[PDB]
Structures are given as structure tokens and as C-alpha cells.
Amino acid sequence: ECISVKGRIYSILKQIGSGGSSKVFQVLNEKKQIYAIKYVNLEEADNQTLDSYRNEIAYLNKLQQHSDKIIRLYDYEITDQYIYMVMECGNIDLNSWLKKKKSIDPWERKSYWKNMLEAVHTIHQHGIVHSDLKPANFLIVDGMLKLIDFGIANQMQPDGTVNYMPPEAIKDMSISPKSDVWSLGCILYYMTYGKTPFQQIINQISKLHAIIDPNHEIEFPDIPEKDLQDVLKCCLKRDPKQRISIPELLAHPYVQIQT
Ligand SMILES: CCOc1cc2c(-c3ccc(C)c(S(N)(=O)=O)c3)n[nH]c2cc1-c1cnn(C)c1
């Protein structure tokens, strides 16, 4: 029913998220303002994971200044036993919203695209490459996608797919900013064609076969927005060296040409 963080009290109104030993609550302060609060129980945590949490917090904090396309962290508490993160509250994670909506509006989809670019651009500018990027990581907050996590700390599932893994991450076992470009591509592909590139492929053992396979070609059906079709093509190129960059993407006409 009730969470104390650095003096203040919040009433738990609902659980929204539930990773390993972490839980996210939709809560309310005394003035009845909403906030998401992340509780991470630490009793079991070993130094690797403990450092991962400390790392996420520090970056999440640092990055506050640079962009509003990053989840806002209002304040936090941390002891040897727990973590509480008081954060901004949104409407829905993107993943759970790409199921709900039938097919997206052009103007919104572009807006969401800009939003993600700015977000991922920011983490890159601070030497972070979020390797496991996916729509579950973004969060709608009054017409804005904001980034929830950095792939530094262990992932939470909102109350795990391989649709977004980039080639070079699969071909890896015997990293690049470009990895995130692929994953963002996949999210945008979804937002134009109602599905990811390989989400019709059934078996996962072989889902990661199509991805790596140069001979396997990806289907880009024509659409009224010719720019968008190019972005998709440029993002989903299998060779990191020849895949478009975030800074290139930010100057692409899809983001830049008006209407
Ligand atoms: C596992 C999901 O993580 C988060 C979810 C949220 C939300 C949120 C997400 C989904 C829903 C459906 C809602 S809702 N409409 O308020 O119930 C809020 N707001 N702020 C949030 C902040 C987080 C979060 C978790 N870690 N970090 C760093 C941010």
C-alpha cells in the first residue's frame, strides 16, 4: 500500500512492471500526483548486477540534462537492501501499443521516429550502446516516446523476443553504434507494415537463421511515403559498415522534409 522514498510517501495504486528482483509501481504522492517508482530488492544481488544497477542510475541521472526523450528520474534512494527510483509515469510501453492499434498514422509514426532517434542519439553521445533495443524499452508520455532503459542493467518485463536482434550480434559468437540502428529499423518496419521483418517466421531456432542469411532478402512493399521506404532499407542493411548511421538518419529527408 505505501512506499517511503527520501522522506516522502507514495500510495501504490497498481503494479506495472516485474523484472527479476525488481517491481515497478504506478503510485501517487500526497498531492495525488502520479509517478512510477521502481523497487529493486538487493538481498540476493552479486557485485556484477549491483554495479549494473548503480551504473544505470548514474547514467539515467547524467542523461537527464541532455534530453527529454529520456525517462525523467526525479529522485532515488539506495541502501544495501533496496533501490527506489521515483520516475515519470506514462500511458503505455510501445510494445503493448503496437498490438492494440490496428495501423499507425503517418504523422504520429514520424514523430515517434524522431523521438527514438534523439533518444538513441543521446546515449551514443555518452558512449552507451544499448544492445537489446526493442519497443518494450520505449514509453509513451503525452505524445512522446521516451527511453526507459540503457541495456546496461538487467531488463524488466512490463505487466522477451528476438525479432530485433541485429545480424552482427548473432554472427558475434564464435560493439557498434550501428547495432541500435538495426533494432530501431525493426521497430519502424513494424510501424509501417504492421509487423517486424521476421515475425512471420515461426521457429526461433530458424528465426535467427533468416537474420544472418545474406541470400535471404527482406520484403519492402511500396508505400506512399518513399522516404520512409528508404529509411527502412538503409536501416535493415546487414553490413554495419554500409548501414546508415544515427547522425545520417537525423539528416535523412524522412525526418527533415516538411509534410
Ligand atoms: C518495466 C517498465 O518500466 C517502467 C514503466 C513505466 C511506466 C508505465 C508503463 C506501462 C504502463 C501501462 C503504465 S501506466 N499507464 O501508468 O500503468 C506506466 N511509467 N513510467 C515508467 C518507468 C519505468 C522504468 C523502469 N525502469 N526505468 C529506469 C524506468
Side-chain angles (χ1 to χ4, degrees), residues 1-3 5-22 24-30 33-43 45-47 49-64 66-98 103 105-106 109-154 156 158-170 172-202 204 206 209-211 213-236 238-240 242-258:
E1 194 68 80
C2 270
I3 301 173
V5 176
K6 260 205 176 178
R8 310 181 175 176
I9 313 296
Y10 314 78
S11 57
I12 305 170
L13 152 73
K14 168 180 88 157
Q15 194 188 110
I16 40 197
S18 182
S21 65
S22 56
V24 204
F25 301 103
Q26 193 195 45
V27 309
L28 304 164
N29 67 355
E30 21 130 286
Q33 286 157 309
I34 214 179
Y35 290 110
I37 287 185
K38 177 155 129 196
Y39 163 78
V40 193
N41 187 256
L42 297 181
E43 306 263 307
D46 55 303
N47 309 6
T49 96
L50 207 57
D51 249 276
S52 77
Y53 282 123
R54 295 164 182 163
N55 197 277
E56 183 203 42
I57 300 186
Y59 273 112
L60 183 51
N61 255 139
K62 184 75 174 54
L63 268 32
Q64 292 285 269
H66 304 281
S67 185
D68 69 12
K69 304 309 165 312
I70 290 175
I71 191 75
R72 178 100 161 74
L73 176 66
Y74 291 104
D75 181 54
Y76 62 97
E77 170 163 313
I78 183 171
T79 79
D80 284 317
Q81 283 69 49
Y82 57 85
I83 295 181
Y84 286 123
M85 296 182 227
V86 181
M87 293 176 272
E88 215 181 354
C89 205
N91 307 28
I92 195 176
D93 68 286
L94 192 74
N95 198 39
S96 307
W97 177 101
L98 296 169
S103 215
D105 161 55
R109 164 185 41 203
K110 188 180 282 197
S111 189
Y112 283 175
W113 183 243
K114 306 204 201 80
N115 286 171
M116 295 174 272
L117 284 187
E118 176 178 348
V120 183
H121 191 33
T122 303
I123 67 180
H124 287 188
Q125 276 179 329
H126 290 58
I128 296 163
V129 188
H130 185 329
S131 286
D132 189 26
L133 214 47
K134 73 192 78 61
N137 294 136
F138 292 92
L139 171 92
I140 311 179
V141 171
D142 58 292
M144 249 190 278
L145 273 181
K146 289 183 195 209
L147 186 63
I148 276 180
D149 75 327
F150 304 139
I152 294 162
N154 335 132
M156 292 90 203
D159 312 329
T161 157
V162 276
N163 280 347
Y164 305 87
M165 209 158 182
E168 61 275 25
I170 287 166
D172 173 52
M173 19 271 205
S174 202
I175 195 59
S176 169
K178 294 283 182 68
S179 312
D180 297 349
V181 174
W182 176 289
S183 317
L184 289 183
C186 295
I187 302 186
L188 188 59
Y189 190 115
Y190 199 114
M191 300 168 81
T192 60
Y193 295 142
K195 67 189 279 305
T196 100
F198 318 86
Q199 98 159 61
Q200 31 77 7
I201 299 188
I202 13 70
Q204 276 194 341
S206 55
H209 284 327
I211 291 164
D213 185 17
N215 312 324
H216 187 288
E217 297 172 11
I218 320 183
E219 213 182 354
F220 301 98
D222 300 334
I223 55 162
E225 322 177 72
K226 290 298 166 181
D227 291 348
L228 179 43
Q229 167 167 178
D230 179 72
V231 171
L232 267 39
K233 291 190 188 188
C234 301
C235 292
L236 306 175
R238 279 176 177 98
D239 174 26
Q242 286 168 327
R243 189 183 297 126
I244 193 164
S245 82
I246 295 302
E248 263 159 359
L249 277 168
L250 288 153
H252 189 279
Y254 179 56
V255 184
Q256 283 295 333
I257 263 62
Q258 185 49 53

